[model samples]
Target chain A: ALPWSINRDDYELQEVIGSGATAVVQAAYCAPKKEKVAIKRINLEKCQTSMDELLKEIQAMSQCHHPNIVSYYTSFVVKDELWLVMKLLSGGSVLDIIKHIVAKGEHKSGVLDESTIATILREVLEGLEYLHKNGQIHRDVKAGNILLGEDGSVQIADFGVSAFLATGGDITRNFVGTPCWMAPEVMEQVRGYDFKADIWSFGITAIELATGAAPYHKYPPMKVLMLTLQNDPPSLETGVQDKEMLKKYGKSFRKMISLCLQKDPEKRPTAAELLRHKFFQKAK
Target chain B: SALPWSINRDDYELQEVIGSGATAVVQAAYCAPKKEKVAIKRINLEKCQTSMDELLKEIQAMSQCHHPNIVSYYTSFVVKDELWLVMKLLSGGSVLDIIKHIVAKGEHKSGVLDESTIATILREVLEGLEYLHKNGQIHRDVKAGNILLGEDGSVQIADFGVSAFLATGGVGTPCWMAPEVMEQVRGYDFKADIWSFGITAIELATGAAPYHKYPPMKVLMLTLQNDPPSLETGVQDKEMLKKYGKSFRKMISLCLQKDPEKRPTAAELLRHKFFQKAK
Candidate 1:
């Protein structure tokens, strides 16, 4: 049955868990369902887009049902606000977790162990695999959007910028994604882009997990855009500062990221194919 | 004091109409500089009956409020004879729209809000009301139609067109009007808003306020003469009573007290068991 309560009164809002330019994420308790849910509230009055754009995001999220992907519970409208209810992942985002680990000095190199990195990446890749196979492209796939559970469950989240291909051969030309992790082809926009764009971001995220920061982390948006387009693909070797720590990452892990970072979208391995790499063999 | 950005008509590309009133038409517009969508209330000065000072007061009151649960005012400017008041566009219509949507769905047996949902909404409304009351302001009209929601799950109290600071008048929707407001004896205060809030609660629970079927004048008469409406009063569905919990009923009772002084303040009501049940 459809969750029909459009009333704002049904969900008891708690503290704000996160906030963005146009929306705020709150930890809420749903009275009817008797469960904790993460509610993403977007003020439509303040947003600079059409309702069609927001509807597409909700549609894409509702369409995906995979273990490695965050679950969409329900959504409703109250006054001029849209409330998107999703399963609460209390362990925080991958970015927060990694930042916490680095702050706590749990890892000497300020990076996850290769095996732990493999574990997180494998689950993320599985989610990407599911999305790509279904003709969906998760345009934003960075550490911040990847969430975790206290039980060590990793899931891909935030489909705000995702695109769904009408056909498997279709491509999107919009330059609508985070600048730091964006792919070269996506920034070019001349030939258009496809699911391989996510793979490039995945590779950037791998380096982010291994080095605590994505390539060109300190640069501004336009600067990062210029660097990503003009420079060569960033690798684990280039991002890692300490020579000894660089050596600890191993050949298989470096090879997997190399294949994903291929400048040519065509050369980049599919998420499904990347899962078969020896790097992910250490995941399980 | 520094003024808000002096925006121009050329800065915004007005789209479809979102709402309209007697003298103004609100449109969804895109602001290039801000890189955001906004609702532009373009009031035709020539057609306006109210004094410009009153309009400025409304604007001033709206700008003064700064809370998470309140609609944000961006900037305002004039274009020829039109006053363009730019504000956050809350796309999720209003609480009344939500109720109508749920009623239209016809899936839920009651066709109204559950107790928990009502509690959650009222708690948020009360928080906004508390802010207003503490600031010596009164919403004057604290009904579902005046309350707005954000797509991001933010509940905001809007429509300061009739709101005033340390003032009183019978200026509200008759169905949700407090007795003191209707009588205008010693004049009403912030407690009048609490009376309206109580009516809004019943409106959420039953899909309509008490005496809703009656004409506006009749509704006013009944409110003054009749006992304060409850969850069961004028409700066609007897099952509605069974649906709501005791905490909700008691909370509504506190707000519906005939005497303005007897009615709990917005802050006091926030601590009620019904609102506490929200969590």
Candidate 2:
């Protein structure tokens, strides 16, 4: 049900905005649904090896309907391509704010505004909470993958690497994700990991957004793997040069990052528990 | 039964805009039922009308492509004023984007690629080009910015076989273009793409192209009089660049040959000692 087969006459196609190796994105006007929509089309014939996994994951994503998460609408195939349509958030992505700071040449020091950081994190964490509660883990959570709405909506995206939990306590051992944003337990897991792995990446993503770059951005790709597996959890302190001012923002933000970056997955705070933390209380 | 051909706006819940340029805007969206995250690119039909055939040709070109390093083509349909394209999301951005990220960090960002990393990218790209060439298609365009990567080690060749306008605006195609296009205009083939691939190597080695400092117009003048410049030219450390030694240079030199005939085929080049030594 991920990329379902449906008729194309219902939507008015718009312009092609984004491009990738296997797919292209379009902004469309759905005549039948009568709303603006974003269409993501993938070539079913192209994913020769991981077709089953990709389809299964897509089916899982289709069933995932929530406000915090980017909701899927319908999927269909036309001309041998798989089209998955969903809600369109007119705002931008979390990566935009940081990239904009750099492009504007304004990132002299860790130039991110704390209030923005708290706000973005709060929204993504809510998305994570919903995802975890529904027996899923957003294995890949980073600034680039977080979407913002024109009305200030925060939604987590990019479910390509996400996985659903088994019926009981079956952990997953899939080693996936970008090196800089990956969680420790995820890289070296035996039976794979649980929702806490997402929590770890959430902490890294928080730090990444707070700063202009990702954690261990300087390290060689392989070295990042080594450091993530061997070293202590990365923190904002390493990237935030002006510690005196960071402290002025108080410790709740830092506390939240630490809670998520726990070495032991079990010790990490669940998205639901973190929602009630002091950090979000002072976010707005 | 095959998948359906038509869809509607109410079918999707589109998210925020991810990328924007002079031509179109790309945004993130979710697919219901599949619970998948995908990107939607909107292109103005008015702007692309002149190249509608080219655009369609690209879809056909991409549809036939099936390599891991190449971007996959999905289905496309037309609406009133625009042509909507749906594609998978690659959060890692383009390879050029990653390099720029390192450069933006200044020298302190000190994020340099090891040989293994470079070799992995080169080999994967070579594999993709080989597929396209074997299938009787010429990429026509091959460069770093056109190469996309996923956060999870996915290296993809984009905008190939497809026309330039159909793809996003390329920031620097001239830097990687082969002399065949500039020298005589005597018509080129797949080798032209190989030439660009070599330039991409130079791009990865030295943050910019060989004559990148000069105006775009002058690069053609500079490229014509050359028997491929050494990869060591813009390289920061002669010693580090030399670590890969003759093997690497030999491979690039073969690709940069002034005579297209002398330049080896993608399949032949794959067997070069550079990749042989990779494993």
Candidate 3:
């Protein structure tokens, strides 16, 4: 494939696999080799921007190698559009999974079974472990960033809004990512935070897994922020109609999430510590 | 870590395409503030229609690599929507170029590398591969083309676009690729790298990978046919080949084991007599 650079002609763009606000992901065929490749195309004029720095951050962010994380193939540019060629994940996002399970009308509303939630979180936690160890803060750990593969494997995606905390500096001062899954310290810009912020988001994710929707999904942005900071931590058991099942996993699954949603960042268990909780024991 | 995550395009002057592939280009660049000359690799994201996470895998692989034998990553930034990896400049080019040079000097006949030279290069590469395996990674592409030599004779492994954590089957270059990788039914693992290493050994001596003369489809057929290629195929010197003799052949055989279960690991191969003379 020959274009402005390299062998751009090597790739034959087939169809748009997915698209977002500023980017479009297309499935392309790499000829001469005939390999299926996915390309993420972004328009600079519309980038609204990130020339080198964001690219650098993303390059650094891409290094988190874990089974639970989607991997990058390569990234380049042609004309006004920047392209990122990556692995093709056939299964839709975790959000898509949540919707599917919800549509089944089997469990209470959209909430998943204990075992399924555990299975999904187990993989997301592993991905978090890899990212945190690499001096990176996913900054965004919502279901949207979490994806599932056709093989039923869970992987984390989306790094455009992540933070690179190489110096172990406090990142709470800046408001980044979705407020729904944001931690208390992150919302208040309180003494600033680090990897612990991700723990808070994981707690929210657990809540999302237990109910088909994210915590405070019904509230406005400002109201949600205030509620997250002022109200007691959110719990899954509160909304569950399955009384007996709620009690069964009460101390195990829901309890772990409660620990993650601790108002005080210090009290929140590290992703590693949380993985050892009894809840994930039922995952595999 | 010394550089910020992003930078302005006007900051540095970029130069010519040093090397290129189907969807990426490696350019020579000069960073004035750091007084550094680095090789910047740009892979077009437009054609790379994979997940954003997959885009990060190569960056992540290189970022985690700290060994001397593995290429050093100074920084990686994006400019003009292209991912640029600022890596340590390896002036000696790749072993593939060396093979081509040796072949040219041999008057179109198969090139023959001295036992000591082959051992020196492969020894360092083995060390790098060991580091990757230990760190829970694999260099899917291990052909001579991906192996580079620094100006001071330092060998470093570069490129990780398709590299994976843990293991997976069905990835990597065709000619130098492992059998199990080519046969994706059962999938493959670190043992697959060993097979590529074996093919690389042949590539070094013969100045070309096995089935290089065949078309892409035919090469795929021959590779899957599971027939192991030998260095003695087109070479004319029996005595020179004997000079490499048992140790080399044994090492290659150990690496080319069709059953990945029987293949020796990078660590196991390090102790082989073939590299005994390498320090």
Candidate 4:
């Protein structure tokens, strides 16, 4: 049997599924393999990054093989462009699901059920645990980067800004990751940051799943960074506006999120530690 | 500032896929601007086991080669993450394909090529090898599969995937690999390809390389431990050996030498009676 063809002619590009600053993802059908896949075409010229850097990132992505993490199929180059083929998670991002509920005016009763949020966060935590145990950090962990499969199965996506620590206690000072979900230590960039930065973002994603928005969602990126550094750590109570909706979440859930949102990076629980919390015990 | 771009995907309309490998696909395409048909080999960079440095080496070797007996490289460009190498199309397929087609049609009793056709194809291949060797390049993978035929009966050597300039390592098909390459104790040079060329000569005559019936590991063991295979040794049809001229046998024996230094250079082989007598 013929393996997956590298030629673009083998695939028929369909509708655009997602787009970002440097890349646009499309739903494509591979006639030879008789399978549907998502193709992410990143403009190399526009990316302004060296070929070596991009290739290193691609190699990193290809090495990750976990059930709760998105799987990479293959990648190729096409004239100043790079196309990444990956598994198609047609259920869209968790952000899309949250926004859809809000669009339908269902946020008044709370954006999502407590158990559903737990389930999604549990899967995300498993993926983070895999990365953390392997000395890799998924720096950008947010509701948007957490995708749902067609059967509602959850997996973490988007490793564009992830870092792999060369040795134990390694930390990075590079200014990266989305501001709204960025950890306080990431914004300070004084002593550098480690895998604990992802924990803070994971807590923010939990809040986002509950309320359909991250903390300081209305502010600019720079303003959000300042708020993250200056203000108290956001909890379910602070994220959920409706007083009636606020009482729906239990103390265990709030305790778990608070553990992740600790102001000190050392105080924040590891993904593996957080998985054993009472909140995840309620997850199906 | 001048535009640094070469050919792109927009310049060609891709048609049916002609061949494929582990990390690349070859397709027949029509170049609108050039008003000619071409073959585009698209390699997936992410899946390619070879490093970018080696791939660049191959591309450089192909782009610099210029000879009538060698396939001409038109242009190459990157698309997304795939490298598309455009070259002159040989619509008549490879010599292996031709042999298999003839065998399928039962056109020959021994499932082999005629002496004259074999002499002509081998001569052109030797010419291509001569050019490459003089330029310090070795066509590490030399077989009937890489020897392509044009519709107009032109013969040219293609596939530089494993070719290198004074490179050392056991990096070619096992059956056609030289003894030095198989041992990997010392570095091999141009003569490694001569061993494969000899194996290819046998392939063209018998419609299959020696040890083709055995498993790959077994083939490697036999190649290392046993005597060099010849037209008289492996052929099922005992009468087939009587058909070949003594010049051809002598030429093949020269190429099949176990010692790399004992093998003749491509230039020297081109002047041999086997190719000298070719029309």
Candidate 5:
């Protein structure tokens, strides 16, 4: 919310642009800095942890300068609240588009269009590889958090809950994240998870990119968790029922997704490895 | 109810994943709601090393944190031990990347230091550090990797795992270690952080580690205790004298001083004349 200070907070807080468990993003600041900058204001009073979390963002954001990462300009603490200054992505989220299609009766037909999924998947992998090599861990990867910048380039945000892991470093052990988007090994919290688990999460994100939804969604959250734990990841491959679809992009994306969704942490691909995969390379 | 936010792994028109961490996959997803493109950081609890409770704590703690130089937290949800944190996206460069670029521009192998630019960066960082301190917070691990740049040429900071929270514990790597870190009465304190600031500052002044001119960690420690470098001799920046002068050098020297108490608080250091001047 405070990121607009330098930009003059030009865009009005036009209602709730988006809402979630611990915070909300307002559709504000539409110019100068360009695109819709999601102004997220965290009221310390209603927050989960101390104000320290805000400072961590400050410390890390202040040092980061990248083409694909969200930009934080300035932030401050006032009146028992922490306001972060960041760029707002105007494209909204992947889920919003999917729902629009489903609502329009397009989704009822089942299976998303091929070209769209490929573009989205390519952009996401590119963005993730950028973060991974930079030594940052998004921790919370899902359709809801991805923001598309004005340039059509997508970037990842919400690192407050993310871990910054070193290459070949030990995984941070503090089980926290949404279930459907989580890698299976993460469910057990193995001595903390490593960057590879992120690989698994990527597979789920890939599925979200493909079908406009998540895996094992036939059941409720708890049921999904139980089944996910009890059984192997549901084969979304079947979702691409059209054999031609599987024959075309399936081999590469399938291998990529399968390795990413590996149940064993050891078997999963690293973010960097995924970047070099044939599937991701296909995106180019 | 795979958490209302999760897309069928197959349903999601899987886009490219932008980043990866120990437990999260960051991808650009096409949001069905609001009819927009959004960034989602999907965190898997089972695959994550931290427990569900800890993930909640991290989100809750970060929820209220907002700063221009800080990263923003959007929303969080739990669906099968995975946490979905939605947030705004940024595009720019990293300090490390910039540093490498800056050095590449210089005639020397590493590149000459840009005092004016360095001053700009340091001032902004001090602003971030100062804010964190006032709120009873500390960015325990302050390095080049954690900060980000905006599309509009602005700088930002992210990642709060070890800020003020003792959960990360006081342990740190040796590269940025302060003298007091080895044997402090209270084990550690904020002033000990100043020592780290000094190290960072010096690193900025010279692209390489100070004692790399020497050899081994033990030798580096010996150099810090007995043979510290002087600002004028080692630091070749002329603008530094006009901007930082005695007060600036005094601040860094004090931070490097053996006594932790003598080092200024994050706020005090920011207020010093050196930080105030961009001219």
Candidate 6:
């Protein structure tokens, strides 16, 4: 067996699990503790953007420690590349799982289980609560960016585009990431949005997780953007569809999601206030 | 004839320029040695044909005014006839775009700008202007387009490019301007700015600019120089008004005083119990 194999070494690289231009994400076995890890190596030389900004994202995410948060392990430079060792979940990404459910028709089961959703949601909220408190904005919080642990625990990952409080970057009034998953405020890329905007995306993320379908799946990209930026008239399907889900965590969940999606950022709840929300408390 | 600068994405880049106005704002873009990126803003010279001295005073004042809510100016330099200034480029452009998008969406979905939302934005803007007022700077250019949003929703006042230190000090949009600035009078003071800010807040709530339906700057200037703009068509939704309440009307009206002094300064208006009330 290769010494670099997960079976033999301390944190052995199993495979080139994922790859980006500047970095290669590999699945590995962390032998010291016998746990799995995802090694995201940033070729600092190849990192698409600025290193200063990259450092800021790490520093902020590190300061913002939470269970819902995908752990950001140590970062080191190797051969001119910046390697970020982070938590690797065996369950895969929420995006992958949702796709699995969709192709399998999970939503067909009309009466969705409240307890399971509440559990998953609470974990996600806790993670977000930790993020907002630390003044870190997870610019990317969709199903694709969220990972699943072995215990059905959802961990918010991918801090590539995260920003700290009061620290606006070189985005140049520019829009970043998938426009479909974005909040209206974020979509108004030039509209100057903030943290609460991330929550809006989180709202859509939760919907996808619960239903296994990206909302507005049938719309074109521009149409999707226009619909989202609009108050997106509260829909039973896109918003609160399952009455059982509504009855159990309705007010809290509904309120939190709606508030997070407020057209004006100021109308949205603060990160701390969100944690204190009764909806989040439903889980524990 | 100089080569047009490359558009960062869309326009020919031009040598950086800064408009000298009453406000402590400067257009900034040049490489920051420590941060590896280049930001650029064009100093709006076209807008400053109103008054040079007034503009200079406003720039002097805004340059000195410092606050978290305000558009930040780092440094300034003259480069090849373009006054290149360096300042924080609030990436999320103007709040106007959001309002425009929402307005464009209309009732088709529930995309119309909501009342409480407008109030919150206006409140934050007032806070920023209040800070500038304390520093004795008049944000002469108070408009929806000038308010910036962070991707996260934290709002800041941008385009201090033409703000004046005094009520009558700087040059700015005629449609949103206080009659005092257009008339070329001095001592327009904080109240005049308050009047202009009121117009801005109204614009925030409604997609319409002050007398936006009018032909152009000339017609709007004539009106601003004379009568008060009625809030009739602007605040079209009575149910909406009832929803937002007297605080909205009172706050906006307080800024519409005909006399410049009748208008409130940023500091006084911010503390106005009107803003203290919760929706």
- DockQ metric for all predictions: 0.01, 0.01, 0.01, 0.01, 0.01, 0.03
Model 2, span A14-92: residue lDDT tens: 9886777566778889775668888877765553323454566677688777767877777766876777787776676
User: Candidate 5 on A1-284: residue-level lDDT in tens?
Assistant: 43345433444556676665445666565565456555666655554445654465467667665655666665655466556667767776766777787688665434355555556666666666766676655555666556666577766666542222211112233222112111112112322334454566667766665665666555454454344444565445533455342333466666777777655556666666666777655543
Q: Which candidate is the best by DockQ?
A: 6
| Model 5: per-residue Cα lDDT at residue A178 | 17
Chain A of model 4 scored by TM-score: 0.86
Determine the C-alpha RMSD for candidate 5 after optimal superposition of all C-alphas: 27.7
Tens digits of per-residue lDDT for model 5, B52-88: 5655555665676677777655555555766666655
Tens digit of lDDT per residue, candidate 4, span A7-37?
8888889999877666788999988889999
True contacts kept of each: 0.00, 0.00, 0.00, 0.00, 0.00, 0.00
Candidate 3 C-alpha lDDT tens digits along B1-279: 376523555556788779876666788887777777777776565555433465576667677778989888866766665666677778998988887887777633424677788899999999999998888876766778779899897998876543222111111111111111112212346776888788888878766666676554454445544456667643556553554668888898888765565778899999999998675
Model 1: DockQ score: 0.01
Instruction: Provide the TM-score for each candidate, comma-separated.
Output: 0.46, 0.44, 0.45, 0.46, 0.42, 0.46
Q: Which candidate is the best by lDDT?
A: 4
Candidate 2: chain B TM-score equals 0.81
Give candidate 1's TM-score.
0.46
Give the alpha carbon lDDT tens digit for every residue of B134-247 in model 2.
887777556667678888888888756433434422101111111111122122457767777777776666555566665533454445434465576555665545445667
Stronger candidate by lDDT (3 vs 4): 4
Please list the C-alpha lDDT of all candidates, in the order they appear.
0.70, 0.64, 0.65, 0.71, 0.54, 0.54
Score residue B217 of candidate 3 by CA lDDT: 43
Scored against the true structure, residue B263 in model 5 reaches a CA lDDT of 66
Q: Which ten residues in a row are the worst by lDDT in model 1 chain A?
A: A177-186
- Candidate 3's docking class is incorrect
